């Protein structure tokens, strides 16, 4: 199921690439380069964060989240992935770089 969802996502990427528009070609090219170099996708991080927020949200807030995301093609994410991402320790070198910048 995840592979089918990712195939649809990369179909969107391919549509952006093979289109002919300069901006779409450039953004598809940079996405492809990031994927080939293994750079993580910010979308997956957002999905994990919003899943944990939905898990720990109250009735009204979680209902609002569910009704707003009922139509978005979000991946089927097990709670184990969210737990792993949340329990991953933060990168102090990246924190230092960000604060210095």
């Amino acid at each position: 199921e995840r592979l089918a969802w990712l195939r649809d996502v990369w179909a969107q990427i391919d549509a952006d690439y093979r289109s002919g528009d300069s901006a779409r070609q450039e953004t598809a090219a940079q996405e492809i380069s990031a994927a080939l170099r293994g750079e993580p996708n910010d979308y997956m991080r957002w999905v994990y964060e919003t899943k944990r927020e939905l898990r720990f949200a109250g009735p009204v807030g979680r209902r609002a989240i569910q009704e707003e995301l009922q139509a978005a093609e979000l991946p089927e994410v097990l709670d184990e992935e969210v737990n792993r991402y949340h329990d991953l320790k933060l990168n102090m070198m990246e924190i230092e770089r960000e604060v210095k910048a």
């Binding site: 649809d8 179909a11 979308y43 109250g58 009204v60």
Partner: protein
């Protein structure tokens, strides 16, 4: 799970206008011509060699043609030839010819169109059928040869075998035997193939005695029974429903006949083991036989082997067997054996046995996409999947969550009824298994309602009414005959309702009147009903049913024996209650009859004896003594006893009435008001691992205390509290991981929290941190007093993206069962979805429309997700105009 129409729509929505443009290889060819092809891309340098390479790569999945040119089937379809053969056989049977020379012209039955004929045949080694002596038999043989030549068969042994097989398949056993005897008398040798052609008639009907007589006749005629004859005998026993006989014949063929089994033999053995139930090791035997055929014999499995093995494996709910079935299907598709209706039926069976409605719907959608039209059996097994899912519902977890399964049951029932409505709308002829599946669904719904919600009588009554309506009306509405499975379902429902009289009435009607063989499930249901019934002789009747099974050949299983023991031990309670009720009634009668009829400190010698001092009048023991002495007697609490042999007072209403008569107001009026300590998730763990957390819960007088030692050390208060806190930390870790619900706000937690948190908690009345988060993140929902509104007051926005075709089909709940034409007519009903019907056909048509300018497709991805967090917003922005055009009226 989407229809091909919605799949094509989603394809175009994802790919924008690029979908209808040049393909990837066309783009690569254009880039190569321009000279700007990137180095990493494989260049299309030589067209012919690239075509040869791709054809060689594609050849490995190319399906070998398994079409069979059945001459017997051609003869059967030739209606005129069939009637010519029938009239010839009727003539040969009623008025057999005569072996006289000048009788052909004399006889009008077979009108025409020195040296002895038998002597000539003996001298020249030629059959008498090829001799023309103007005889009656010669005329009959010439007419038969002309008819067979017209059909397309030469007047020889093979042609006679084909024609006799074609006759025997369509009955006409006597006519086939007459033709066989005429050929034997005319000298065309009655070969083993002709004997097999004769045996086909008995094999189709299942006449074991006739097949054995044919084998014996072939042996007596000096002809060795061949592998085809043994195959026909095995098929005869298989059709006569004696499946172990097939294996016995195989073993005897290998031992005494000395005939090496072939692929047909293995297929027959696999079918017999698949339908065999005499021994519990049929599936392991079939698996081992399949492995033996694959490895030792060196045969390669074909479609019959794969279908038989998958049909056998789709009968057990074990995940290992389901994985084996899926692996077999994958190997079948890898070996160039395209899936078909039987393959999808086997997959649906494997999914439905374990109760995977999602897997069943996925299989149905894949079949619809691949263009194999769904049959009635697939829908029947989808209904069975719904039944199994209703069985497999986690009622324990539902009870723990305090969730009614009634909406889920209603959803399943309405889905199955919608499937039935679709079937009756399509015009398909109603099959008995479909109505049987509906009856099983209704009966199982009633049983589950009785087992899980014994107080909600309304839904139980509705389920029973639906089941009774189906059983009384649908079968004779569709002119169908109730079968053993329908009787099994209805008798199971009656047994669970404990209507033993009606259950046995139906059972004996089925046995004696309709002459049916009750299934082992029916026998198990009867035995369990009688065991559960606490009346005297119930186990005797259960053993009667068991010995009936034993003498009728029904399989007796160790699981059945274990369940018999367990159910008897359980129903011992009801038996004891009835036995006590008998004496209770006797004592009540004696009490009524009696009612109708109507020195403390000095011993016998006169000496003053010690007497205990009076207990405290305010003591609870004195209160109990006075209550026992002054309350109403136990014989006047209830006049009439229970409906079924048991004393009253088990129901909460009767218990409350009895307590009221005794002068006590029961605080636990309802069943739910009982604390129900079996729901505890934390205390049992502590008791199991560390010890009694309470300690003084069971204390008589300063004793039986479960507390740590005063001194300390390894068995002290510090260590005890440390271990308890470690267990609580584990539970909190589970809560954080989401395996447990987030706990509410405690007094200690509030006192620990910061002042602002305490202030807002107090002024909002929030009970949970989730409610606190809602209060802090939705300031508009605060009352002027500071309290938060109930959650129902807030109504979140509803995006129009849920109105998309695929979005609305995802939660359709009937789309997988709907055919693609139905969905296309429901959604579009115009030329845009006219068109077999497939996603790629839709894409080709829409590409042609785009190239002709009759279709407007927005450039760029209309549906966006998976790349940017704000992708659904862009999807809505791109879909607003289309939504408004669709919704506006002009």
């Amino acid at each position: 799970a989407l229809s091909p129409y919605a799949q094509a729509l989603r394809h175009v929505a994802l790919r924008g206008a690029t979908a209808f443009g040049p393909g990837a290889k066309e783009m690569e060819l254009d880039m190569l011509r321009k000279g700007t092809l990137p180095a990493d891309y494989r260049p299309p340098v030589q067209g012919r060699w690239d075509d040869t390479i791709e054809r060689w790569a594609y050849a490995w999945q190319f399906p070998a043609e398994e079409e069979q040119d059945d001459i017997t089937k051609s003869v059967e379809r030739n209606a005129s030839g069939m009637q010519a053969l029938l009239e010839i056989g009727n003539k040969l049977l009623r008025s057999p010819p005569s072996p006289e020379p000048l009788s052909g012209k004399a006889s009008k039955l077979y009108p025409p169109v020195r040296l002895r004929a038998e002597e000539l045949s003996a001298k020249y080694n030629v059959p008498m059928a090829y001799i023309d002596d103007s005889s009656e038999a010669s005329n009959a043989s010439k007419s038969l040869a002309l008819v067979m030549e017209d059909v397309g068969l030469e007047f020889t042994e093979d042609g006679l075998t084909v024609v006799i097989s074609a006759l025997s398949r369509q009955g006409y056993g006597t006519i086939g035997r007459a033709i066989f005897d005429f050929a034997s008398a005319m000298g065309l040798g009655p070969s083993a193939e002709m004997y097999r052609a004769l045996m086909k008639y008995a094999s189709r009907r299942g006449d074991v005695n006739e097949s054995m007589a044919l084998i014996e006749e072939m042996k007596g005629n000096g002809i060795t029974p061949r592998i085809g004859n043994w195959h026909e005998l095995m098929y005869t026993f298989y059709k006569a429903k004696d499946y172990p006989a097939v294996s016995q014949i195989v073993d005897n063929m290998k031992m005494y006949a000395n005939i090496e089994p072939n692929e047909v033999t293995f297929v027959l053995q696999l079918k017999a083991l698949a339908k065999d139930n005499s021994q519990l090791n049929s599936l392991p035997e079939a698996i081992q036989l399949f492995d033996q055929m694959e490895n030792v014999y060196g045969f390669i499995a074909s479609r019959p082997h794969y279908d038989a093995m998958m049909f056998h494996l789709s009968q057990s709910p074990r995940p290992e067997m389901r994985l084996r079935c899926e692996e077999l299907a994958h190997k079948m598709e890898l070996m160039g054996i395209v899936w078909n209706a039987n393959t999808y039926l086997n997959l649906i069976r494997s999914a439905q046995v374990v109760g995977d409605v999602a897997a069943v719907e996925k299989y149905l959608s894949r079949m619809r996409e691949e263009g194999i039209p769904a049959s009635i059996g697939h829908l029947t097994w989808a209904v069975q999947a719904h039944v199994q899912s209703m069985i497999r519902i986690d009622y324990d977890a539902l009870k723990e969550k305090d969730e009614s399964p009634l909406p889920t049951w209603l959803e399943h029932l309405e889905t199955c009824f919608g499937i039935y409505e679709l079937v009756v709308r399509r015009g398909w002829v109603m099959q008995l298994p479909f109505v049987n599946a509906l009856l099983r669904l209704t009966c199982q719904a009633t049983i589950l309602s009785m087992e899980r919600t014994p107080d909600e009588a309304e839904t139980i009554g509705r389920f029973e009414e639906q089941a009774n309506k189906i059983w009384n009306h649908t079968f004779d509405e569709w002119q169908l005959q109730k079968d053993v499975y329908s009787y099994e379902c209805y008798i199971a429902l009656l047994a669970h309702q404990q209507r033993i009289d009606e259950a046995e009435k139906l059972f004996q009607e089925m046995i004696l009147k309709k002459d049916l063989s009750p299934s082992r499930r029916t026998y198990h249901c009867m035995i369990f009903m009688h065991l559960s019934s606490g009346e005297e002789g119930g186990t005797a009747r259960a053993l009667r049913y068991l010995e009936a099974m034993e003498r009728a050949g029904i399989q007796v299983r160790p699981s059945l024996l274990k369940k018999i023991v367990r159910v008897n031990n359980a129903a011992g309670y009801k038996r004891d209650m009835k036995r006590r009720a008998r004496r209770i009634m006797q004592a009540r009668e004696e009490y009524l009859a009696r009612k109708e009829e109507g020195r403390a400190d000095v011993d016998a010698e006169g000496n003053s004896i010690l007497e205990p001092l009076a207990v405290s009048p305010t003591s609870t023991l004195a209160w109990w003594e006075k209550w026992k002495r002054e309350t109403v007697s136990k014989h006047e609490l209830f006049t009439e006893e229970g409906a079924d042999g048991t004393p009253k007072g088990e129901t909460f209403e009767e218990k409350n009435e009895a307590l009221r008569m005794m002068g006590i107001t029961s605080s636990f009026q309802t069943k739910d008001l009982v604390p129900q300590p079996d729901r505890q998730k934390l205390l049992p763990l502590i008791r199991r691992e560390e010890g009694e957390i309470a300690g003084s819960l069971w204390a008589m007088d300063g004793g039986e205390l479960s507390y740590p030692k005063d001194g300390g050390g390894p068995q002290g208060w510090g260590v005890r509290l440390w271990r308890e806190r470690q267990l609580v930390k584990r539970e909190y870790q589970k809560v954080l991981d989401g395996y447990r619900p987030v706990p509410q706000l405690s007094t200690l937690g509030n006192s620990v929290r910061t002042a602002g948190d305490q202030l807002d908690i107090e002024r909002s009345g929030a009970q949970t941190p989730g409610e606190l988060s809602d209060y802090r993140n939705f300031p508009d929902n605060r009352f002027d007093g500071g309290q938060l509104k109930p959650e129902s007051e807030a109504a979140p926005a509803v995006p129009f993206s849920a109105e998309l075709v695929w979005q609305g089909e995802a939660n359709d709940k009937l789309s997988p069962y709907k055919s693609d034409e139905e969905i296309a007519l429901e959604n579009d009903n115009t030329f845009f979805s006219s068109l077999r019907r497939s996603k790629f056909d839709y894409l080709e048509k829409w590409r042609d429309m785009y190239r002709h300018g009759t279709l407007e497709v927005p450039e760029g991805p209309t549906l966006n997700f998976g790349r940017t967090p704000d992708d659904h917003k862009e999807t809505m922005a791109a879909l607003v105009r289309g939504w408004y055009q669709r919704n506006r009226k002009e």
